[PDB]
Design goal:
The complex is a heterotetramer, with two copies of chain A and two copies of chain B.
Chain A: H1 8-12, E1 20-23, H2 33-41, E2 47-53, H3 55-62, E3 66-74, H4 84-91, E4 96-99, H5 102-113, E5 118-121, H6 129-132, E6 139-145, E7 151-158, E8 162-172, E9 178-179, H7 188-193, E10 195-205, H8 208-214, E11 229-232, H9 250-260, H10 263-273, H11 278-291
Parallel strand pairs in A: 1-2, 1-8, 2-3, 3-4, 8-10, 10-11
Antiparallel strand pairs in A: 5-7, 6-7, 8-9
Helix pairs in contact in A: 2-3, 3-4, 9-10
Chain B: H1 3-13, E1 22-25, H2 28-39, E2 53-55, E3 70-73, H3 76-85, E4 88-92, E5 96-98, E6 103-104, E7 107-108, E8 116-117, H4 124-130, E9 132-137, E10 145-146, E11 172-177, E12 180-183, E13 192-196, H5 202-207, E14 220-221, H6 227-237
Parallel strand pairs in B: 1-4, 4-9, 5-10, 9-11, 13-14
Antiparallel strand pairs in B: 2-3, 5-6, 7-8, 11-12, 12-13
Classes of the chains: A alpha/beta, B alpha/beta.
């Protein structure tokens, strides 16, 4: 079988400016943060992003690399809750916002996974969501009557097709079989299935037989058809939660948010954490932690 | 009893006759109320641990130490499935609520260039089109209770198209604030006073709301917590008094 | 919390003639066969059945209790494969057949679970499936163009809403929380969510804490909102497979199929196995087995 | 090499350049072919254990004893998800196959009153509208290869509406029989001879098919299994010779 192990930069060099990319996980939970940091090091820009947003999106906005965002929400999941870089991008008018209901985003990925042009959904009707979409979001009428008479008109959620997707899981093999070891898979499978290029990071790469013995079969969320390249990235979700491996780095996340509030503070953060490799970031982070 | 305790019981009463459905309290005050309901008059409700498991018992809010017993699995995918199926009652916060019950947790100002950014709409649109939704507001003021919200995250009664049966599950139930209990039984489903908390006059509500609340002068007093309710709140559910941080002044 | 424990006959007495019922499991796998036998003992008839059919459907057809069947297939999963009672019903013209593709049946249940009037699907297009449905199966056109230009027309799979559903699982508690312990949940969750009345049998009722300690969380397929009544039915899937608990009773299933091939053989089968209680059936079955 | 071995290799060649997709061989002959491919020229294919797990290695067909090593989980729900996504090639049997590649495993006779009942359409409609589908026929005869099938379970090229992009994934690839390899590259995508097995004349095929097969006289001989292929088939994949029961007379 194919050995799909690659490095962070090698994966990101498959991106092109203008692409639509999906970032998996949820909020400040199991985000592919090492992939995001590698995007920050590249020249790739003008990205359309599909995400249940958190500090992943914040980092991309801080770099001015985002043209448009399709999102169900943006949250840090802990105080100060709102991502300050996403907030800056929104209040400055830097990004086009394709805001939607959380369920709609999932539905959009499901339609892309099934290669369907749309799925019907109630979520969205009556809300400001259609107005975010500026007439791009259309409706569909049921050909069957409701129990009660009348024909329902529903949101036609379009497929959220992706040029590339990035996800992070706890354990994988060299061929891209992978498992989540936490309580929630989120929607990483749909992000991968909706994309033309599939990129996965894991905390640790093991033999197939070790992978399958360490989890129940229901945790084997990713098979070889769902991955083009796998990257071993210990700490690759930092500073979001990666379940039994490590929690959210709460103090560091607050440090991130505080630093975003001023020009000098951000420049110092970039210098300290984001100006070298992933290994430099991990060492700087451990040193911040050792201080506390 | 304190104002916070009267509010906690008012939140509990949201779930009377809920039956065997998932209650999703998204604020601490609602979560005290939901746990009170489960331990008393709504014993069949389902509650998560705040993440992805269903709780078997009803432990203290915010608690650490002993692990919780579980009765099921409720990852976010299954929450979406549950909400579309309709077997749920969510209590959300609200940066704005308007007189037809539209809620905003998204942003202030224009959609493509807001003056202040919050979470985005989250699941509010799906929640309000699918099943019982109520709101907890800890600082009842004019900047929260507005004429019309900046961004419609949770839909209100004025958005219902009576010719489209897709709106047939709308059930925006009540708003509980630090001042009173409110519903949408006024004319055109405009906001109506159910009750005013002890110590609150109609004038207090009038000065704190940007529109006129129906039946405000006729509103009875919100009922006091009973001795058993106070015991459960103080000793069992909220021993650290997280409820007190939910309300101001 | 509510105590939902009930007996087989008590559950079935909530049915009425003419109802639409769902039978869960798949083929000759984890079927609620003790519930089926209880339906055979009642006067309930003229049933519309929604099923991935196996010997469950055969037994109902042998009793003349079926008006219409919505099915993705009918199979015994072992030789002679084709269920002879379903075959008789079909060749005699005794039932209305609403045959469909396997994926379509799941889609139909999903639409009912989401309370939607339809979901779009490609499966069905160009096949004999629409002709089985006699005008009832309609199409829907996408309001968004295909990648390539032009607008797709898809099957509009209607919701398969049920008056009642029956399922069998391996373990549960008295409130209806339940787990599958085999390798496949099949679609029992969708059957329950699509129905107004939800009936579950399990091999054994245990304490909630025992239930949750015996399986990974991913195997907790059924929660309290999904069940109205739960029945302890050890051997309740017999003669279909019930995973680690017991396999398919291959020799008995063949005995079933052979007996259906003649008038005398069927009359003798009914007398021996289907004329008493579930306990009488289980004792007769063990005696057939003890002989071999 | 025997006729069964030539057929097994022909089945294997169905998967050349398949890439990293799920192969679903629903007959023993196809399953020998698929395992042969995985061990040789198509090493990236996925294969289940015949139930709900993905196999990590490629064990013998019909093997007993030690459990198989697994690399994933593939319950029926996930098969439906995989097939709609398109990453699959299924090889099915057939009670009837017609000249445009339509398949019947449903029934013989009228739809609401058949003269003989089989399984119903099963997954054939979903398979044939979504991804590569091929057929294995072990007794090539007129009652199998018919002008037009009684019931369209698997759709053929004549059912494609060229104005509806929903048909754009149709890929009914080949038919491998005990006599030859066939495809649908004839006029109007009618059945065409790819190759005839050693020992088989055009006349044998003509007398066993209810319609005329395109390019039948020009059809080369199906390639022989190599020594390495024979070793893998005879000793490693099919040591019980289940392949020999697949073909008749």
């Amino acid at each position: 079988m194919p050995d799909k192990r690659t490095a962070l930069d090698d994966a990101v060099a498959q991106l092109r400016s203008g692409m639509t990319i999906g970032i998996a996980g949820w909020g400040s939970r199991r985000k592919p943060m090492a992939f995001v940091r590698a995007i920050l090091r590249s020249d790739v820009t003008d990205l359309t992003v599909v995400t249940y947003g958190g500090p992943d999106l914040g980092l991309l906005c801080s770099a001015g690399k985002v043209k448009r965002v399709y999102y169900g929400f943006v949250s840090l999941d802990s105080p100060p809750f709102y991502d300050p870089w996403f907030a800056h991008a929104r209040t400055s008018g830097a990004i086009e916002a394709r805001e939607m209901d959380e369920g709609m985003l999932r539905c959009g990925l499901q339609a892309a996974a099934q290669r369907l042009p749309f799925l019907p959904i109630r979520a969205g009707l009556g809300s400001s969501v259609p107005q975010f979409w500026a007439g791009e979001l259309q409706t569909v009428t049921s050909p069957y009557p409701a129990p009660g008479g009348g024909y329902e008109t529903l949101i036609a959620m379009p497929a959220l097709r992706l040029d590339a997707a990035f996800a992070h899981l706890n354990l994988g093999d060299s061929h891209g079989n992978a498992a989540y070891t936490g309580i929630d898979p989120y929607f990483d499978d749909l992000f991968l299935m909706a994309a033309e290029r599939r990129f996965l990071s894991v905390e640790r790469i093991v033999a197939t037989e070790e992978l399958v013995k360490s989890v129940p079969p229901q945790a084997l969320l990713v098979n070889r058809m769902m991955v083009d390249a796998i990257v071993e990235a210990p700490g690759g979700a930092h500073f979001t939660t990666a379940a039994p491996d490590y929690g959210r780095d709460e103090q560091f996340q607050r440090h991130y948010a505080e630093a975003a509030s001023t020009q000098v503070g951000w420049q110092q953060f970039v210098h300290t954490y984001l100006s070298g490799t992933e290994a430099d970031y991990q060492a700087a982070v451990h040193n911040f932690g050792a201080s506390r | 009893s304190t104002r916070a305790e009267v509010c906690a019981v008012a939140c509990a009463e949201l779930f009377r006759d809920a039956g065997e459905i998932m209650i999703s309290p998204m604020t601490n005050m609602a979560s005290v109320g939901a746990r009170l309901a489960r331990l008393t008059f709504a014993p069949d409700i389902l509650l998560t641990d705040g993440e992805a498991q269903l709780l078997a018992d009803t432990p203290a809010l915010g608690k650490t130490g002993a692990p919780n017993r579980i009765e099921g699995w409720m990852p976010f995918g299954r929450v979406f499935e549950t909400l579309a199926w309709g077997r749920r009652h969510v209590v959300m916060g609200a940066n704005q609520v308007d007189r037809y019950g539209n809620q905003n947790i998204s942003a202030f100002g224009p959609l493509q260039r807001p003056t202040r950014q919050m979470f985005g709409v989250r699941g509010s649109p799906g929640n309000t089109i699918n099943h019982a939704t109520s709101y907890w507001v800890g600082n009842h003021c004019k900047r929260v209770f507005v004429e019309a919200v900046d961004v419609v995250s949770g839909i209100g009664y004025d958005k219902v198209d009576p010719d489209n049966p897709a709106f047939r599950f709308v059930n925006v139930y009540r708003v509980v604030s630090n001042l009173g209990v409110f519903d949408f039984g006024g004319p055109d489903h405009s906001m109506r006073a159910v009750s005013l908390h002890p110590g609150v006059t109609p004038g207090d509500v009038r000065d704190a709301t940007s529109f006129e609340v129906h039946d405000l002068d006729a509103a009875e007093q919100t009922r006091l917590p009973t001795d058993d309710e106070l015991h459960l709140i103080r000793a069992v559910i909220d021993p650290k008094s997280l409820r007190d941080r939910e309300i101001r002044s």
